[PDB]
Design a binder for this molecule. Structure first.
Ligand SMILES: [K+]
Ligand SMILES: [K+]
Ligand SMILES: [K+]
Ligand SMILES: [K+]
Ligand SMILES: [K+]
Ligand SMILES: [K+]
Ligand SMILES: [K+]
Ligand SMILES: [K+]
Ligand SMILES: [K+]
Ligand SMILES: [Mg+2]
Ligand SMILES: [Mg+2]
Ligand SMILES: [Mg+2]
Ligand SMILES: [Mg+2]
Ligand SMILES: [Mg+2]
Ligand SMILES: [Mg+2]
Ligand SMILES: [Mg+2]
Ligand SMILES: [Mg+2]
Ligand SMILES: [Mg+2]
Ligand SMILES: [Mg+2]
Ligand SMILES: [Mg+2]
Ligand SMILES: [Mg+2]
Ligand SMILES: [Mg+2]
Ligand SMILES: [Mg+2]
Ligand SMILES: [Mg+2]
Ligand SMILES: [Mg+2]
Ligand SMILES: [Mg+2]
Ligand SMILES: [Mg+2]
Ligand SMILES: [Mg+2]
Ligand SMILES: [Mg+2]
Lengths: 52, 56, 187, 147, 53, 125, 128
RNA sequence: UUCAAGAGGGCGUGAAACCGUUAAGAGGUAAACGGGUGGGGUCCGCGCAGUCCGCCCGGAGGAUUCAACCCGGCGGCGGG
RNA sequence: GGGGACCGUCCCCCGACCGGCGACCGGCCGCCGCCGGGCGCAUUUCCACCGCGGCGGUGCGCCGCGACCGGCUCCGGGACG
RNA sequence: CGGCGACGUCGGCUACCCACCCGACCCGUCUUGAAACACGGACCAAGGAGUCUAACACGUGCGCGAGUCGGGGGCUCGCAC
RNA sequence: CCCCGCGGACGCUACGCCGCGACGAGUAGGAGGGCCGCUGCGGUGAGCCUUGAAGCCUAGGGCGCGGGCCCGGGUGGAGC
């Protein structure tokens, strides 16, 4: 049971993975390459009103 | 001495060795002497610019 | 059969970065083209430094960069380091510097910019000086590492001043026999 | 990842890299630091001089806190205050010198490695080295002791 | 997460990571007149082995 | 940037097919359908694609406009050409060459248009 | 009749026979799959004359004709019609074939579509 | 009966070793193996009068409309 | 203890000059291209068929033959010094 | 440039059986030396042996950098994940 | 100052493609590559499948130097 299942990742690492993930989510080629069918989406940094 | 056979080549032997089997060490590569420009590029500074100069 | 030895045929050298950093790979592409299509030996040195490991790209402190920039005849020249530029809190006056680096520490970056300096990346350096003209190629201390204190002759040999590997430092840890004449020998 | 290791490449090779003649056996040469003065003497003498024997005086019930005395050098001295402090003092017309309390910053002794900028300063510390005191007075400063 | 000229106001110590390559447009950089002026002419003729007659 | 986006999807993409010592890419606007920086139909500011018409006759020439690169809904302009093969190839040639709109894809688009039209004519007995 | 490849070079095979494992003829427990002999006294490993030959890189096929079918095409496995259109511009160099698990109804559509796109199918009549 | 007993109460699938029978071939240097051919056999090749397609020429037929102009729409590039 | 002043970073604005409209976008123009609809209704254009037609490319269902050119090689004649 | 092509033939060096010529001792293992009168192995199936923890050392990759690191704790609807 | 022709092959997964030269024995051992193979997890294939999954059998067709893999036929019956 003491196989060391967990890993610690530096906080600056982890914040920098989030920034890369967010920046990639605004580029159509990368989101399409994940196969998300963003063919008719008006704008990929896609923002809706607070009413939702 | 036991590993080699050697002697004194004559003019014809030098000609046929250079013309039939003459290869130049150009940029560390074994390049066949098909053109005079290959000889002149690497040996022109010494006055040797053709196969005849190399044979001489 | 031919009489040669094949143990040195394969030269051991970096032909590419072992990193998967796509930004580093992009500017390796840029400087692979510049080294090939120019006669500038500066591009050749920069390209091969881009392949190098982190231990072979030691950080360059701000003090060391300033000191090399202050040498005569290096005014209005770009300081180029293939690695990280580091703030040195031991200096109090930062002059105006034109700098190209792979990476600059936030505090060092603020100090350079506040002093009227300019910071370039290697893509901008290619546009500024494609052949590297008017540049000073600097390097951090390559042997400024703790490992090099342990390298060399063995500690238990005469006239060797190499640091031994000890879990602790104290009077009880490897200071007796073989270290003083009273305890057998010293060498 | 076990898929990246030599074991995956040593399948089909009978000795698993340990060799046919010498084999891989339990503990040839002893266990741990066995035979450090006998059959492993050369390694211990070559790489760990001083390992064997006693040197010095022992001290029962050592309390590391009593000997607590962190040190700071003069080259790092001005980093203990704000950048506002040092520019204000430099451009100050009077002879007013700022006070640097190294005990507040967590240091007890002021060592004298490096050089100081040419401006006076009052340095408060528990201990001063001889050369640190000399350099502080050279720039027109003063050293005052605290307990 | 902040800007490159503002630190993050909800992380107390974080700032956006910096680019090691500002302009990642390789085609535009290589076609720039500054780069093209410094280059030597391309060697595009292929020299295949000559059969030694 | 095209080069930066290429370094991300050159080996990691949902359109990537790697089988039988071959590699293919199935993104919508990939002429020749090959995994390459030149022919990738997603990473470039301007791209051209040739597709069969919605019905069984003609071709659809889709180009990428320059304005809304982050707005995929209006980023592609689709035109339908339903004339004879020689006239259809001339229109595609003029769209690419006269506009200087990616001239490196001229023959790829023309060859693909020929393949589509050749597939639309009825089979023989 | 059949769709012809763009070019049909003469395919030269250095070896036409399989490399069988040493002593796979003497035991059922040992399969014909090749395994490098590593015994200290093995005469096959030592390359004695008249023994079982060992595969090596010298037997490699010409890169121009590698993976080429006898028909001059190279094969791409397909599972549906959508994967078939990747070969539209590779018609004269690559041939499609349908995966074994594809149903009889679905591979009928693949064969029909491939006939239209002039793609050659190695197994066009495979469930019928 | 069952869709199926080529699922029949230790019954899903049902390998190898080993055995029976049928078919083919062979047989005094134990078998087995590597290389090279030859013979026979089972199959494969829509094999069986053997490619396709670009331009041009000639013959015999159809279809609009070919170019250029007009209107509209949409794009690319340039603009102190 | 507050509250102030100052300093460093900011902020949205009131405004001008500076480099450019950029890979941040619109409107106007100019050129070009495509599409749709008219007109153009035939020495134009396009479609399919035929010729045992020509020019190119690829390649011949199978089994064969010849020719010249070049590379390597082993030999044989003739003549000259 | 020639010959030949459907119920008899054409091509398939792979794959099945057979024949002949040449070559060919049974593997594994210890060993200076194994075909050994050296040991293990009748045959087939399934199982079957450098792993995990800790500690070092060096190399490489990543982040930050004279700093670095929250791993213990605490705060976030208390919990599909 | 291209224009009776408005036209002109391929390429460059830059971790790609191309050229030239030399070289190739190997136990113990070291290293690299593996679109070799097994099982499970996160993504992805608008993947496959009762119009037949896995598995198994096969004088069937092939691919790879090889590890192995794909396809045809049969059996099988729910997954891959
Ligand atoms: K070396
Ligand atoms: K080992
Ligand atoms: K070998
Ligand atoms: K059953
Ligand atoms: K035995
Ligand atoms: K914690
Ligand atoms: K999956
Ligand atoms: K293989
Ligand atoms: K099956
Ligand atoms: Mg050799
Ligand atoms: Mg060797
Ligand atoms: Mg070995
Ligand atoms: Mg074994
Ligand atoms: Mg052993
Ligand atoms: Mg084979
Ligand atoms: Mg066997
Ligand atoms: Mg041996
Ligand atoms: Mg059944
Ligand atoms: Mg049963
Ligand atoms: Mg039987
Ligand atoms: Mg033994
Ligand atoms: Mg003995
Ligand atoms: Mg033996
Ligand atoms: Mg004996
Ligand atoms: Mg024994
Ligand atoms: Mg047994
Ligand atoms: Mg026994
Ligand atoms: Mg097993
Ligand atoms: Mg070798």
């Amino acid at each position: 049971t003491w196989r060391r299942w967990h890993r610690r990742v530096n906080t600056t690492q982890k914040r920098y993975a989030i920034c890369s993930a967010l920046a990639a989510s605004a580029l159509p080629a990368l989101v399409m390459s994940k196969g998300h069918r963003i063919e008719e989406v008006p704008e990929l940094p896609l923002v809706v009103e607070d009413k939702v | 001495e036991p590993y080699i056979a050697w002697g004194y080549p004559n003019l014809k032997s030098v000609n046929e060795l250079i013309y039939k089997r003459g290869y130049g060490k150009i940029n560390k590569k074994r390049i066949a002497l098909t053109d005079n420009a290959l000889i002149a590029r690497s040996l022109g500074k010494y006055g040797i610019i053709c196969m005849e100069d190399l044979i001489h | 059969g031919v009489d040669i030895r094949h143990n040195k045929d394969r030269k051991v050298r970096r032909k590419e970065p072992k990193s998967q950093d796509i930004y580093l790979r992009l500017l390796v592409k840029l400087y692979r083209f510049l080294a090939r299509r120019t006669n500038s030996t500066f591009n050749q040195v920069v390209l091969k430094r881009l392949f190098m490991s982190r231990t072979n790209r030691p950080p360059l402190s701000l003090s060391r960069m300033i000191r090399k920039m202050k040498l005569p005849g290096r005014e209005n020249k770009t300081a180029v380091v293939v690695g990280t530029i580091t703030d040195d809190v031991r200096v109090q006056e930062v002059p105006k510097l034109k700098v190209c680096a792979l990476r600059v520490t936030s505090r060092a970056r603020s100090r350079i910019l506040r002093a009227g300096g300019k910071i370039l990346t290697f893509d901008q350096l290619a546009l500024d000086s494609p052949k590297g003209c008017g540049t000073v190629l600097l390097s951090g201390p390559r042997k400024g590492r703790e490992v090099y204190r342990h390298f060399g002759k063995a500690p238990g040999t005469p006239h060797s001043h190499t640091k031994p590997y000890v879990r602790s430092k104290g009077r009880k840890f490897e200071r007796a026999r073989g270290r003083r004449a009273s305890r057998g020998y010293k060498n | 990842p076990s898929r990246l290791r030599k074991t995956r490449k040593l399948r089909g090779h009978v000795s698993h890299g340990h060799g046919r003649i010498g084999k891989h056996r339990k503990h040839p040469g002893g266990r741990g630091n066995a035979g450090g003065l006998h059959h492993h003497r050369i390694n211990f003498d070559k790489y760990h001089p001083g390992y064997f024997g006693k040197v010095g005086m022992k001290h029962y019930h050592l309390k590391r806190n009593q000997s607590f005395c962190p040190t700071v050098n003069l080259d790092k001295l001005w980093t203990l205050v704000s950048e506002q402090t040092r520019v204000n003092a430099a451009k100050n017309k009077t002879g007013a010198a700022p006070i640097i309390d190294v005990v507040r910053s967590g240091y007890y002794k002021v060592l004298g490695k490096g050089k100081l900028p040419k401006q006076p300063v009052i340095v408060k510390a528990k201990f001063f080295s001889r050369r640190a005191e000399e350099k502080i007075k050279s720039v027109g400063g003063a050293c005052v002791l605290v307990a | 997460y902040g800007t490159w000229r503002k630190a993050a106001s909800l992380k107390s110590n974080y700032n956006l990571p910096m680019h090691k390559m500002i302009n990642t447009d390789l085609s535009r950089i290589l076609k720039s007149p500054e780069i093209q002026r410094a280059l030597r002419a391309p060697r595009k003729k292929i020299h295949r082995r000559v059969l030694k007659k | 940037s095209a080069h930066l986006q290429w370094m991300v999807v050159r080996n990691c993409s949902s359109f990537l097919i790697k089988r039988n010592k071959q590699t293919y890419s199935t993104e919508p606007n990939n002429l020749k359908a090959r995994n390459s920086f030149r022919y990738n139909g997603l990473i470039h500011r301007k791209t051209v694609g040739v597709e069969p018409a919605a019905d069984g006759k003609g071709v659809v020439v889709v180009i990428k406009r320059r304005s809304g690169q982050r707005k995929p809904a209006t980023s592609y302009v689709r035109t339908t050409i339903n004339k004879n093969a020689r006239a259809t190839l001339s229109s595609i040639r003029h769209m690419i060459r006269k506009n200087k709109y990616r001239p490196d894809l001229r023959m790829a688009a023309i060859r693909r248009a020929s393949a589509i039209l050749r597939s639309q004519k009825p089979v023989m007995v | 009749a059949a769709l012809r490849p763009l070019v049909k070079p003469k395919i030269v095979k250095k070896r036409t026979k399989k490399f069988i494992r040493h002593q796979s003829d003497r035991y059922v427990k040992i399969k014909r799959n090749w395994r490098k002999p590593r015994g200290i006294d093995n005469r096959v490993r030592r390359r004695f004359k008249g023994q079982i030959l060992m595969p090596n890189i010298g037997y490699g096929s010409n890169k121009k004709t590698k993976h080429m079918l006898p028909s001059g095409f190279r094969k791409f496995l397909v599972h549906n019609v959508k994967e078939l259109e990747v070969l539209l511009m590779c018609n004269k160099s690559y041939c499609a074939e349908i995966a074994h698990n594809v149903s009889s109804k679905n591979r009928k559509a693949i064969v029909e579509r491939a006939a239209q796109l002039a793609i050659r199918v190695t197994n066009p009549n495979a469930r019928l």
